[PDB]
Swiss-Prot record, chain A:
CRISPR (clustered regularly interspaced short palindromic repeat) is an adaptive immune system that provides protection against mobile genetic elements (viruses, transposable elements and conjugative plasmids). CRISPR clusters contain spacers, sequences complementary to antecedent mobile elements, and target invading nucleic acids. CRISPR clusters are transcribed and processed into CRISPR RNA (crRNA). ssDNase activity is stimulated in the ternary Csm effector complex; binding of cognate target RNA activates the ssDNase, as the target RNA is degraded ssDNA activity decreases. InterPro entries: Cas10-Cmr2_palm2, Cas10/Csm1, Cas10/Csm1_subtype-III-A, Cmr2-like_C, Csm1_B, GGDEF_dom, Rev_trsase/Diguanyl_cyclase. It catalyses: 6 ATP = cyclic hexaadenylate + 6 diphosphate. Residues 421-555 form the GGDEF domain. Synthesis of cA6 requires Mg(2+). One of its GO terms (molecular function) is RNA binding. Belongs to the CRISPR-associated Cas10/Csm1 family. The lineage of its organism: Bacteria, Bacillati, Bacillota, Bacilli, Lactobacillales. The N-terminal HD domain has ssDNase activity. The C-terminal GGDEF domain has the cOA synthesis activity. This is CRISPR system single-strand-specific deoxyribonuclease Cas10/Csm1 (subtype III-A).
From Swiss-Prot, chain B:
CRISPR (clustered regularly interspaced short palindromic repeat) is an adaptive immune system that provides protection against mobile genetic elements (viruses, transposable elements and conjugative plasmids). CRISPR clusters contain spacers, sequences complementary to antecedent mobile elements, and target invading nucleic acids. CRISPR clusters are transcribed and processed into CRISPR RNA (crRNA). This subunit has the target ssRNA endonuclease activity; it cleaves multiple sites in the target RNA at 6 nucleotide intervals. The gene is csm3. Encoded in a type III-A CRISPR locus. The keyword Nuclease applies. One of its GO terms (biological process) is defense response to virus. This is CRISPR system Cms endoribonuclease Csm3. Its EC number is 3.1.-.-. Belongs to the CRISPR-associated Csm3 family.
UniProtKB/Swiss-Prot annotation, chain C:
The gene is csm4. One of its GO terms (molecular function) is RNA binding. Part of the Csm effector complex that includes Cas10, Csm2, Csm3, Csm4 and Csm5. InterPro entries: Csm4, Csm4_C, RAMP_III_fam. It comes from Enterococcus italicus (strain DSM 15952 / CCUG 50447 / LMG 22039 / TP 1.5). This is CRISPR system Cms protein Csm4.
Length: 652, 199, 296
């Protein structure tokens, strides 16, 4: 277990800084020596020498005192009680490191930017140490000049088509469980690759939406494992989804200096990896697989309505096994918490395994039934549980807060005492996120920890933080997916929460990131497929413009976030509402007359509006502001939108 | 094989709402050509109305299935009537461009409920009376022996359609039409269709 | 002899690819060839010329100004603009092959395609209200081409095959093309003429070959034509459209073929694949290859 001790030492080499904040190497030394299980030679040697050899080389390549003391006390309690040393217990340790040291800077009291967290630096050091140790088992400046690493990027092809292969019969469930099952299947692929390479989750740099980057040793065994994994997963994806889904995995061998941004080869290396991935995605198949594709025997009498395939056996109600499993697990994914990759379950997963969502009792039962059964905890920072990895998900449904509302579904959102009973659908995504990752950071501040921090923060905001963002609103998040967000709820709540989401997204990442969204209005009985398609075209039109836009309702209402939040719903809507409720003589008919005047493009209508405003009994300030708005074109469409929104809100 | 082309015009006698948004706007806009925005008549509406009328007069019948296609088990028949969409005619475009007349109109309607005697406004777009649509029909002469009979059936359907309505709230006085069969000219094959007339 | 056949569509077309609610703006060569086979059977002609010697391409857009071609799948030395790009005009084709088209020019080319507008028409079925029940509403996706635009293709074959193709296209003008051709869609008028620019473009030798039609080779050709080539396997499927096949409609055997624009360093001559299964007549699927050679 020399490797296990080395990885324990590499992850826990900079705990000395933490205990000092309450040479740091010695402090970490005695602090690790305070616990009997954490007394192995590797851990203490790494903590001492990091200021073994491997930990030192990996480290080279990679507020108030009361808070620090409290964190130290909690760390002592966790190490003494919940954390032990041993195989398959590392995942708990890494979850603990991620949960605790995220807010502590890796390097402090230095003129350099403390933008790298302790967790990020420790994880990068552990990954680099694992790769270096693997190469040395395979068998200082010359070591950096030596090629010691592989950057591996694996991307999923056809995710969007797979999500929207829905026939519309059960579109909501299909979309939600398809997105959840795709991201879970990606996580399972990553875990299988890591277990093949005998590496922990620290070597996985990060995963986005159907994309995963991770570094590996340059060993020939690692290359053979990579080739075997690529072939096996390609065959499995062909068997279970003929050209509907695929994964392409490409690697580039790099020296030590490439990781530390020496010679400015970091960006060039990542561009080379992306180009190799693109080439492999272009070819994407082999002769034998093509011949297998074209050697069908039986045509198939019937086909699944959603999956639209005939070779797979079809259920009585016209649903193949995969499609039926997706529909079945849709409810479980939101009802329960734990995800179990077991020998038997509900949805297929590679290596002849199955994914099923169960409670903690089900997860522990499937653990006891058979080992090599993976468990994923969804949105729980506790690390005492073993064989669990935290998988973030934005599973927020307002219907599930009540059983009868859960039975009703989204049809309960249109149940409104006042206001028009319609359903709002939001399709959002980020503008130029790839540009942010490639060139957003300056070349001086480029590092692997930097990009990992950005991606981790983005995923956390998209999935864990989005649930907090929409709390209290009638929103059912169909899927946060990757960076795009598909959300369905009440029209009022959808629009309000889209605005709040924009404000929170500006607060996060220091306002250097922008996202474009589209909001659509559809009746409750309207098919979900049409809602999705039309809101998608709305968001396409919104992103067609320059940077952030919100294509609310009709394509003629392409607005901005500041314009919609203030120029439309604040300076115009609120005065109209207060005039309507305060006045005892005028009602909705007056607003409809103003709307009819404003929609007309003929100039004389403006004059007519004036006449109306003369006998409207309205306040003079509001009268003059309405006149000024009607004179100007942009303010005219703004007032039109405000009037329409108020009428919708005041209907019934 | 032969194919007989029937061209003509569909003169609108009452505003036709062939059916197919913002508050205080047209709740049920008619179908339009996506680019030209001119209202059109979907050929599916014509085919459905003619099939319904022919079925009611005849009465699954072999005539209806052989004219308008059948996918039923065993009896697979290719539809003989290909009724293309009827587009706004250029002549009506000019006649409506003159006198600054909108191509369509927005009828305001209501509905007095039987309980509260309250009304419900409804802005139905209807293609304005006097608008002519260039309809187009193709007949597939699968068999030479039953041409005339089918044409008789077609005539019956058309006759019925001129006393019935086209798509919309026809029982409330929408979409009454008149076919003006400009010609019946054979386009494919040597079959002669001079003696056959739709009306 | 290569003949350019331009179709101007009088009515919106369906051109489904996997369902009824969608509307692709073109069809593969297999769809057009199956339409030609159906026509030649209805017109009581002989199918020997369509099968033995006829090479046709896909339907490609063409505007008032430029004839478009599929974007070849070649390596790029931003990327999203090229990914969104689908069609390249004939004038800007040799430039694209040599890589002189930057991201801005590619985006401007993508925006320069004025083929038409795709819409979704919702329809109803009243065949259940008469007996008992309710109306069943469905939706058909159509694509209305702009007035000066159209869909063209190229045909290559003998003089007799060209004449037979002219007759079949004259019948097809009124038969209709694409799905829902009996419910008002797919009506078009065709014009067959000698092509001048295309004749010069195709009589060009290059280091690479580009597929202009959905094609696939047999076992012997596929063992040599898969050398470092970039392509896209498209899933060609569908139900059988005929009266003399089965009592009930029967699906074809699933087929997979290289998409148009795929680049291959070795030219392969495809074959027509029989995708019939337990039927009274073989359901052909066109997979012959129309090659255009280029330099990169
Ligand atoms: N599981 C998911 N469910 C829904 N959306 C996702 C999911 N994962 C990622 N996304 C986001 O949804 C889009 C769908 O991913 P796609 O795989 O469809 N796009 P891409 O990888 O460029 O296709 P290929 O060139 O590999 O063939 C992503 O681009 C993200 O914007
Ligand atoms: N949750 C995520 N966190 C970090 N990266 C992600 C996430 N999901 C997806 N990605 C990646 O983020 C990229 C977002 O790409 P997009 O599909 O959003 N297109 P983008 O480059 O942002 O420019 P626009 O046209 O939107 O203005 C994807 O292509 C993936 O590479
Ligand atoms: Mg985005
Ligand atoms: Mg995106």
């Amino acid at each position: 277990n020399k490797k296990l001790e080395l990885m324990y030492g590499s992850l826990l080499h900079d705990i000395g800084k933490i205990v000092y904040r309450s040479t740091h190497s010695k402090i970490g030394s005695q602090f690790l020596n305070k616990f009997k299980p954490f007394q192995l030679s590797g851990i203490v040697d790494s903590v001492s020498y990091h200021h073994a050899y491997i930990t030192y080389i990996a480290d080279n390549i990679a507020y108030t005192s009361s808070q620090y003391a409290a964190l130290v006390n909690k760390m002592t309690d966790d190490l003494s009680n919940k954390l032990k040393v041993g195989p398959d217990s590392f995942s708990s340790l890494l979850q603990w490191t991620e949960s605790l040291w995220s807010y502590i800077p890796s390097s402090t009291d230095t003129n350099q930017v403390m933008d790298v967290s302790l967790y990020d630096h420790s994880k990068i050091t552990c990954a680099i140490a694992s790769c270096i140790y693997d190469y040395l088992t395979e068998m200082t400046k010359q070591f950096y000049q030596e090629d010691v690493f592989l950057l591996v990027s694996l991307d999923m092809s056809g995710i969007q088509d797979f999500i929207y292969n829905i026939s519309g019969s059960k579109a909501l469930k299909s979309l939600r469980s398809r997105s959840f099952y795709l991201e879970t299947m990606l996580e399972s692929l990553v875990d299988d690759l890591l277990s093949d390479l005998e590496l922990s989750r620290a070597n996985l740099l990060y995963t986005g939406g159907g994309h995963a980057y991770l570094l590996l040793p340059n060993t020939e065994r690692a290359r053979d494992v990579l080739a075997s994994f690529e072939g096996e997963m390609k065959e499995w994806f062909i068997k279970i989804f003929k050209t509907d889904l695929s994964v392409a995995i490409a690697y580039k061998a790099c020296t030590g200096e490439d990781l530390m941004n020496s010679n400015g080869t970091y960006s060039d290396l990542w561009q080379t990896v992306s180009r190799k991935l693109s080439d492999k995605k272009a070819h994407k198949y082999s002769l034998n697989e093509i011949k297998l594709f074209n050697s069908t025997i039986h045509a198939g009498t019937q086909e699944c309505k959603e999956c639209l395939r005939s070779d797979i056996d079809i259920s009585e109600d016209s649903l193949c096994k995969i499609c039926e499993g997706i529909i079945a697990i849709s409810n479980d994914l939101r009802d329960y918490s734990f995800f179990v990759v077991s020998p038997e379950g509900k949805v297929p997963l590679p290596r002849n395994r199955y994914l099923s969502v169960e409670n903690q009792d089900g997860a522990e039962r499937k653990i006891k039934m058979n080992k090599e059964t993976r468990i994923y905890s969804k949105n729980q920072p506790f690390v005492g549980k073993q064989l669990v990895t935290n998988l973030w998900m934005c599973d927020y449904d307002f219907s599930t807060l009540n059983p009868e509302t859960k039975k009703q579904g989204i049809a309960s959102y249109v149940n409104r005492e006042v206001g028009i009973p319609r359903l709002g659908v939001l399709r959002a995504d980020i503008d130029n996120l790839g540009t942010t990752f490639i060139k957003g950071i300056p070349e001086q501040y480029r590092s692997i920890s930097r990009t990992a921090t950005l991606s981790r923060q983005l995923s956390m905001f998209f999935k864990f933080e989005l649930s907090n963002i929409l709390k209290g609103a009638r929103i059912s998040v169909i899927y946060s997916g990757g960076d795009d967000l598909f959300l369905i709820g009440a029209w009022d709540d959808v629009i309000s929460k889209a605005l709040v989401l924009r404000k929170a997204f500006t607060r996060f990442s220091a306002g250097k990131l922008t996202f474009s969204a589209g909001i659509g209005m559809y009746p409750v009985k309207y098919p979900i497929s049409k809602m999705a398609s039309e809101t998608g075209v709305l968001e396409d039109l919104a992103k067609r413009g320059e940077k952030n836009q919100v294509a609310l309702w009709n394509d003629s209402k392409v607005f901005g976030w500041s314009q919609l939040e203030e120029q439309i719903l604040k300076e115009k809507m609120i005065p109209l509402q207060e005039a309507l409720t305060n006045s005892q003589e005028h009602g909705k008919s007056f607003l409809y007359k103003m709307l009819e005047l404003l929609r007309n493009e003929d100039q004389i209508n403006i004059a007519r509006l004036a006449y109306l405003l003369a006998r409207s009994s309205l306040s003079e300030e509001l009268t003059q502001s309405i006149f000024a708005w009607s004179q100007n074109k942009q303010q005219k469409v703004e007032l039109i939108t405000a009037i329409e929104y108020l009428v919708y809100q005041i209907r019934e | 094989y032969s194919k007989i082309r029937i061209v003509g015009k569909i003169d609108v006698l009452t505003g036709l709402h062939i059916g197919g948004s913002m508050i205080g706007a047209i709740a049920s806009p008619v179908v339009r050509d996506p680019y030209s925005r001119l209202p059109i008549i979907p050929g599916s509406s014509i085919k459905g109305k003619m099939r319904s009328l022919l079925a009611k007069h005849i009465g699954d019948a072999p005539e209806i299935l052989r004219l308008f296609g059948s996918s039923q088990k065993g009896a697979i028949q290719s539809s003989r009537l290909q009724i293309s969409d009827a587009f706004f005619s250029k002549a009506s475009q000019e006649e409506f461009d003159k006198k600054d007349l909108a191509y369509t109109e927005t009828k305001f309607e209501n509905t007095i409920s039987r309980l509260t005697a309250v009304a419900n406004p409804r802005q139905i777009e209807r293609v304005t009376r006097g608008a002519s649509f260039d309809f187009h029909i193709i007949y597939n002469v699968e068999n030479i022996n039953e041409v005339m009979a089918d044409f008789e059936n077609i005539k019956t359907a058309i006759h019925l359609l001129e006393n019935d309505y086209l798509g919309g709230g026809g029982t409330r006085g929408n979409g009454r039409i008149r076919f003006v069969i400009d010609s019946i000219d054979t386009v494919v094959g040597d079959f002669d269709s001079s003696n056959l007339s739709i009306k | 002899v290569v003949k350019l056949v331009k179709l101007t569509f009088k009515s919106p077309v369906h051109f489904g690819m996997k369902r009824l609610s969608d509307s692709n703006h073109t069809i593969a060569a297999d769809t057009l060839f199956s339409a030609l086979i159906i026509e030649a059977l209805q017109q009581q002609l002989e199918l020997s010329h369509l099968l033995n010697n006829l090479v046709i391409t896909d339907l490609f857009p063409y505007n008032k100004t430029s004839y478009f071609l599929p974007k070849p799948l070649i390596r790029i030395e931003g990327y999203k603009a090229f990914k969104k790009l689908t069609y390249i005009p004939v004038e800007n084709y040799s430039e694209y092959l040599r890589g002189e088209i930057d991201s801005l020019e590619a985006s401007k080319i993508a925006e320069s395609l004025n083929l038409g507008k795709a819409s979704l028409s919702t329809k109803v079925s009243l065949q259940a209200v008469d007996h008992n029940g309710e109306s069943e509403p469905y939706s058909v996706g159509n694509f209305t081409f702009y007035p000066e635009s159209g869909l063209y293709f190229l045909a290559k074959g003998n003089a007799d095959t060209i004449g037979q193709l002219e007759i079949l296209m004259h019948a097809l003008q009124y038969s209709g093309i694409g799905g829902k051709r009996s419910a008002g869609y797919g009506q078009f008028r065709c014009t067959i003429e000698d092509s001048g620019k295309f004749d010069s473009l195709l009589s060009q030798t290059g280091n690479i070959a580009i597929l202009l039609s959905s094609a696939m080779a047999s076992d012997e050709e596929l063992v040599d034509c898969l050398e470092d080539a970039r392509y896209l396997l498209k899933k060609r499927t569908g139900f059988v459209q005929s009266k003399t096949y089965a009592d009930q409609l029967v699906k074809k055997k699933d087929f997979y073929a290289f998409s148009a624009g795929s680049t291959f360093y070795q030219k392969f001559n495809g074959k027509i694949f029989d995708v019939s299964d337990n039927g009274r007549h073989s359901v052909y699927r066109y997979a012959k290859a129309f090659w255009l050679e280029g330099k990169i």
